[PDB]
């Protein structure tokens, strides 16, 4: 069922973590659907005040390894990625 992936199919493989350069990345693993378009967004410290999902990688698909890595960022503060129903805060400095 390759499509917009179900909100329960991705799993925290790696909560939002510094990409290794300056941006931030996360890792998610799938649970059924072949390469699917995962609904990734991000809020600020659990608050949907402003979508902090400025995706350095604005097209995450979940393949046999899951979504791989997703890049996101915003000016310093608390960025948490909300992959459908998946959520996890990260303080980016």
Tab-separated table of N, CA and C in Angstrom:
chain	number	residue	atom	x	y	z
A	1	UNK	N	0.817	-1.209	0.000
A	1	UNK	CA	0.000	0.000	0.000
A	1	UNK	C	0.861	1.275	0.000
A	2	UNK	N	1.734	1.417	-0.998
A	2	UNK	CA	2.594	2.593	-1.083
A	2	UNK	C	1.745	3.857	-1.207
A	3	UNK	N	1.849	4.711	-0.205
A	3	UNK	CA	1.028	5.903	-0.116
A	3	UNK	C	1.501	6.746	1.053
A	4	UNK	N	0.713	7.724	1.456
A	4	UNK	CA	0.996	8.438	2.679
A	4	UNK	C	0.949	7.434	3.827
A	5	UNK	N	2.086	7.217	4.462
A	5	UNK	CA	2.212	6.139	5.437
A	5	UNK	C	1.377	6.388	6.677
A	6	UNK	N	0.859	5.288	7.197
A	6	UNK	CA	0.060	5.270	8.408
A	6	UNK	C	0.858	5.811	9.587
A	7	UNK	N	0.173	6.561	10.438
A	7	UNK	CA	0.780	7.242	11.574
A	7	UNK	C	1.340	6.269	12.619
A	8	UNK	N	1.006	4.989	12.505
A	8	UNK	CA	1.524	3.996	13.436
A	8	UNK	C	2.614	3.127	12.799
A	9	UNK	N	2.922	3.360	11.525
A	9	UNK	CA	3.876	2.504	10.825
A	9	UNK	C	5.314	2.912	11.077
A	10	UNK	N	5.558	4.187	11.309
A	10	UNK	CA	6.896	4.620	11.639
A	10	UNK	C	7.116	4.501	13.129
A	11	UNK	N	8.339	4.218	13.495
A	11	UNK	CA	8.711	4.077	14.880
A	11	UNK	C	10.017	4.807	15.131
A	12	UNK	N	10.141	5.385	16.321
A	12	UNK	CA	11.358	6.084	16.733
A	12	UNK	C	12.586	5.203	16.574
A	13	UNK	N	13.267	5.371	15.459
A	13	UNK	CA	14.534	4.714	15.234
A	13	UNK	C	15.639	5.597	15.798
A	14	UNK	N	15.424	6.900	15.674
A	14	UNK	CA	16.303	7.907	16.247
A	14	UNK	C	15.540	9.220	16.383
A	15	UNK	N	15.314	9.646	17.618
A	15	UNK	CA	14.655	10.922	17.888
A	15	UNK	C	15.499	12.070	17.343
A	16	UNK	N	14.872	13.221	16.985
A	16	UNK	CA	15.581	14.355	16.389
A	16	UNK	C	16.926	14.624	17.066
A	17	UNK	N	17.975	14.520	16.273
A	17	UNK	CA	19.343	14.643	16.726
A	17	UNK	C	20.144	15.437	15.701
A	18	UNK	N	21.062	16.278	16.176
A	18	UNK	CA	21.962	17.049	15.308
A	18	UNK	C	22.461	16.195	14.135
A	19	UNK	N	22.354	16.752	12.932
A	19	UNK	CA	22.644	16.035	11.694
A	19	UNK	C	24.120	15.666	11.591
A	20	UNK	N	24.951	16.414	12.296
A	20	UNK	CA	26.376	16.244	12.183
A	20	UNK	C	27.024	17.435	11.513
A	21	UNK	N	26.213	18.417	11.133
A	21	UNK	CA	26.747	19.631	10.526
A	21	UNK	C	26.250	20.877	11.251
A	22	UNK	N	24.934	21.024	11.340
A	22	UNK	CA	24.327	22.227	11.913
A	22	UNK	C	22.820	22.076	11.994
A	23	UNK	N	22.306	21.205	11.158
A	23	UNK	CA	20.891	20.927	11.108
A	23	UNK	C	20.559	19.761	12.024
A	24	UNK	N	19.332	19.276	11.971
A	24	UNK	CA	18.927	18.176	12.826
A	24	UNK	C	18.258	17.080	12.001
A	25	UNK	N	18.417	15.841	12.433
A	25	UNK	CA	17.901	14.685	11.715
A	25	UNK	C	17.128	13.770	12.644
A	26	UNK	N	16.260	12.960	12.077
A	26	UNK	CA	15.623	11.897	12.829
A	26	UNK	C	15.607	10.640	11.986
A	27	UNK	N	15.378	9.519	12.629
A	27	UNK	CA	15.308	8.248	11.942
A	27	UNK	C	14.049	7.504	12.357
A	28	UNK	N	13.353	6.943	11.383
A	28	UNK	CA	12.127	6.202	11.646
A	28	UNK	C	12.107	4.882	10.895
A	29	UNK	N	11.499	3.878	11.508
A	29	UNK	CA	11.387	2.574	10.879
A	29	UNK	C	9.946	2.240	10.575
A	30	UNK	N	9.698	1.533	9.479
A	30	UNK	CA	8.326	1.265	9.059
A	30	UNK	C	7.804	-0.018	9.670
A	31	UNK	N	6.555	-0.304	9.359
A	31	UNK	CA	5.858	-1.448	9.928
A	31	UNK	C	4.820	-2.010	8.953
A	32	UNK	N	5.056	-1.852	7.653
A	32	UNK	CA	4.179	-2.481	6.681
A	32	UNK	C	4.343	-1.951	5.271
A	33	UNK	N	3.905	-0.720	5.062
A	33	UNK	CA	3.878	-0.101	3.743
A	33	UNK	C	5.270	-0.042	3.103
A	34	UNK	N	5.342	-0.375	1.810
A	34	UNK	CA	6.562	-0.184	1.032
A	34	UNK	C	6.774	1.319	0.825
A	35	UNK	N	7.946	1.770	0.297
A	35	UNK	CA	8.326	3.191	0.232
A	35	UNK	C	7.157	4.163	0.205
A	36	UNK	N	6.853	4.671	1.383
A	36	UNK	CA	5.675	5.487	1.587
A	36	UNK	C	6.047	6.915	1.928
A	37	UNK	N	5.154	7.827	1.592
A	37	UNK	CA	5.342	9.234	1.882
A	37	UNK	C	4.923	9.493	3.320
A	38	UNK	N	5.883	9.686	4.209
A	38	UNK	CA	5.548	9.884	5.614
A	38	UNK	C	5.274	11.352	5.925
A	39	UNK	N	4.154	11.618	6.615
A	39	UNK	CA	3.739	12.974	6.971
A	39	UNK	C	4.579	13.561	8.104
A	40	UNK	N	5.721	14.126	7.750
A	40	UNK	CA	6.623	14.694	8.735
A	40	UNK	C	6.419	16.196	8.868
A	41	UNK	N	6.263	16.624	10.101
A	41	UNK	CA	6.172	18.028	10.439
A	41	UNK	C	6.947	18.240	11.720
A	42	UNK	N	6.873	19.422	12.296
A	42	UNK	CA	7.556	19.670	13.547
A	42	UNK	C	6.961	20.860	14.276
A	43	UNK	N	6.916	20.757	15.585
A	43	UNK	CA	6.404	21.824	16.419
A	43	UNK	C	7.503	22.283	17.360
A	44	UNK	N	7.259	23.362	18.062
A	44	UNK	CA	8.259	23.926	18.944
A	44	UNK	C	7.937	23.577	20.382
A	45	UNK	N	8.829	22.809	21.015
A	45	UNK	CA	8.642	22.318	22.394
A	45	UNK	C	7.199	21.884	22.670
A	46	UNK	N	6.734	20.899	21.901
A	46	UNK	CA	5.382	20.372	22.064
A	46	UNK	C	4.271	21.353	21.705
A	47	UNK	N	4.628	22.531	21.215
A	47	UNK	CA	3.641	23.546	20.883
A	47	UNK	C	3.576	23.778	19.381
A	48	UNK	N	2.412	23.529	18.777
A	48	UNK	CA	2.160	23.841	17.373
A	48	UNK	C	1.912	25.337	17.167
A	49	UNK	N	2.861	26.152	17.614
A	49	UNK	CA	2.758	27.595	17.501
A	49	UNK	C	3.281	28.020	16.143
A	50	UNK	N	4.301	27.310	15.709
A	50	UNK	CA	4.897	27.509	14.411
A	50	UNK	C	5.583	26.221	13.986
A	51	UNK	N	5.183	25.707	12.838
A	51	UNK	CA	5.845	24.554	12.239
A	51	UNK	C	7.343	24.811	12.121
A	52	UNK	N	8.122	24.138	12.956
A	52	UNK	CA	9.565	24.309	12.944
A	52	UNK	C	10.202	23.345	11.962
A	53	UNK	N	9.371	22.617	11.230
A	53	UNK	CA	9.879	21.664	10.269
A	53	UNK	C	10.299	22.364	8.993
A	54	UNK	N	11.505	22.898	9.016
A	54	UNK	CA	12.138	23.392	7.819
A	54	UNK	C	13.051	22.296	7.346
A	55	UNK	N	12.506	21.442	6.510
A	55	UNK	CA	13.136	20.186	6.206
A	55	UNK	C	14.307	20.368	5.263
A	56	UNK	N	15.482	20.021	5.767
A	56	UNK	CA	16.694	20.029	4.971
A	56	UNK	C	16.584	18.904	3.942
A	57	UNK	N	15.727	17.940	4.275
A	57	UNK	CA	15.409	16.817	3.410
A	57	UNK	C	13.886	16.666	3.339
A	58	UNK	N	13.234	17.411	2.432
A	58	UNK	CA	11.780	17.536	2.391
A	58	UNK	C	11.085	16.450	1.576
A	59	UNK	N	11.542	15.216	1.719
A	59	UNK	CA	10.906	14.084	1.049
A	59	UNK	C	11.389	12.767	1.648
A	60	UNK	N	10.923	12.445	2.859
A	60	UNK	CA	11.251	11.188	3.510
A	60	UNK	C	10.286	10.063	3.134
A	61	UNK	N	10.833	9.015	2.554
A	61	UNK	CA	10.061	7.835	2.222
A	61	UNK	C	10.551	6.651	3.033
A	62	UNK	N	9.638	5.815	3.496
A	62	UNK	CA	10.039	4.674	4.292
A	62	UNK	C	10.182	3.455	3.425
A	63	UNK	N	11.413	3.015	3.328
A	63	UNK	CA	11.802	1.890	2.521
A	63	UNK	C	12.056	0.683	3.418
A	64	UNK	N	12.697	-0.356	2.891
A	64	UNK	CA	12.988	-1.576	3.667
A	64	UNK	C	13.766	-1.296	4.972
A	65	UNK	N	14.389	-0.128	5.085
A	65	UNK	CA	15.142	0.222	6.292
A	65	UNK	C	14.366	1.228	7.127
A	66	UNK	N	13.178	1.548	6.654
A	66	UNK	CA	12.385	2.592	7.265
A	66	UNK	C	12.554	3.887	6.496
A	67	UNK	N	12.271	5.013	7.129
A	67	UNK	CA	12.329	6.290	6.435
A	67	UNK	C	13.737	6.789	6.238
A	68	UNK	N	14.693	6.036	6.743
A	68	UNK	CA	16.054	6.499	6.746
A	68	UNK	C	16.199	7.698	7.651
A	69	UNK	N	16.801	8.754	7.146
A	69	UNK	CA	17.011	9.947	7.943
A	69	UNK	C	16.236	11.116	7.375
A	70	UNK	N	15.700	11.924	8.265
A	70	UNK	CA	14.960	13.108	7.874
A	70	UNK	C	15.626	14.336	8.454
A	71	UNK	N	15.856	15.343	7.634
A	71	UNK	CA	16.512	16.543	8.108
A	71	UNK	C	15.502	17.663	8.291
A	72	UNK	N	15.633	18.358	9.403
A	72	UNK	CA	14.734	19.437	9.779
A	72	UNK	C	15.526	20.476	10.553
A	73	UNK	N	15.019	21.701	10.620
A	73	UNK	CA	15.646	22.732	11.436
A	73	UNK	C	14.810	24.001	11.504
A	74	UNK	N	15.194	24.861	12.437
A	74	UNK	CA	14.655	26.203	12.584
A	74	UNK	C	15.612	26.964	13.497
A	75	UNK	N	15.651	28.314	13.447
A	75	UNK	CA	16.417	29.122	14.404
A	75	UNK	C	16.387	28.546	15.827
A	76	UNK	N	17.555	28.566	16.512
A	76	UNK	CA	17.768	27.961	17.835
A	76	UNK	C	16.566	28.026	18.777
A	77	UNK	N	16.323	26.906	19.443
A	77	UNK	CA	15.160	26.741	20.287
A	77	UNK	C	14.836	25.271	20.460
A	78	UNK	N	13.568	24.953	20.665
A	78	UNK	CA	13.159	23.566	20.850
A	78	UNK	C	12.405	23.066	19.628
A	79	UNK	N	13.043	22.235	18.820
A	79	UNK	CA	12.366	21.653	17.671
A	79	UNK	C	12.028	20.198	17.947
A	80	UNK	N	10.768	19.854	17.805
A	80	UNK	CA	10.331	18.472	17.941
A	80	UNK	C	9.618	18.047	16.677
A	81	UNK	N	9.972	16.887	16.160
A	81	UNK	CA	9.386	16.424	14.913
A	81	UNK	C	8.159	15.586	15.208
A	82	UNK	N	7.108	15.841	14.445
A	82	UNK	CA	5.871	15.112	14.565
A	82	UNK	C	5.623	14.339	13.283
A	83	UNK	N	6.085	13.107	13.257
A	83	UNK	CA	5.874	12.240	12.117
A	83	UNK	C	4.505	11.597	12.251
A	84	UNK	N	3.497	12.220	11.660
A	84	UNK	CA	2.134	11.758	11.831
A	84	UNK	C	1.677	11.866	13.276
A	85	UNK	N	1.831	10.779	14.025
A	85	UNK	CA	1.512	10.781	15.450
A	85	UNK	C	2.793	10.671	16.275
A	86	UNK	N	3.880	10.274	15.616
A	86	UNK	CA	5.190	10.194	16.256
A	86	UNK	C	5.620	11.586	16.695
A	87	UNK	N	6.221	11.689	17.863
A	87	UNK	CA	6.701	12.976	18.351
A	87	UNK	C	7.921	12.791	19.229
A	88	UNK	N	8.811	13.773	19.203
A	88	UNK	CA	9.956	13.789	20.112
A	88	UNK	C	10.703	15.112	20.016
A	89	UNK	N	10.818	15.797	21.149
A	89	UNK	CA	11.461	17.103	21.216
A	89	UNK	C	12.984	17.000	21.172
A	90	UNK	N	13.599	18.023	20.600
A	90	UNK	CA	15.043	18.174	20.585
A	90	UNK	C	15.401	19.648	20.727
A	91	UNK	N	16.287	19.956	21.653
A	91	UNK	CA	16.758	21.318	21.806
A	91	UNK	C	17.927	21.557	20.863
A	92	UNK	N	17.714	22.395	19.870
A	92	UNK	CA	18.761	22.704	18.913
A	92	UNK	C	19.361	24.063	19.242
A	93	UNK	N	20.677	24.084	19.384
A	93	UNK	CA	21.379	25.241	19.916
A	93	UNK	C	21.966	26.093	18.802
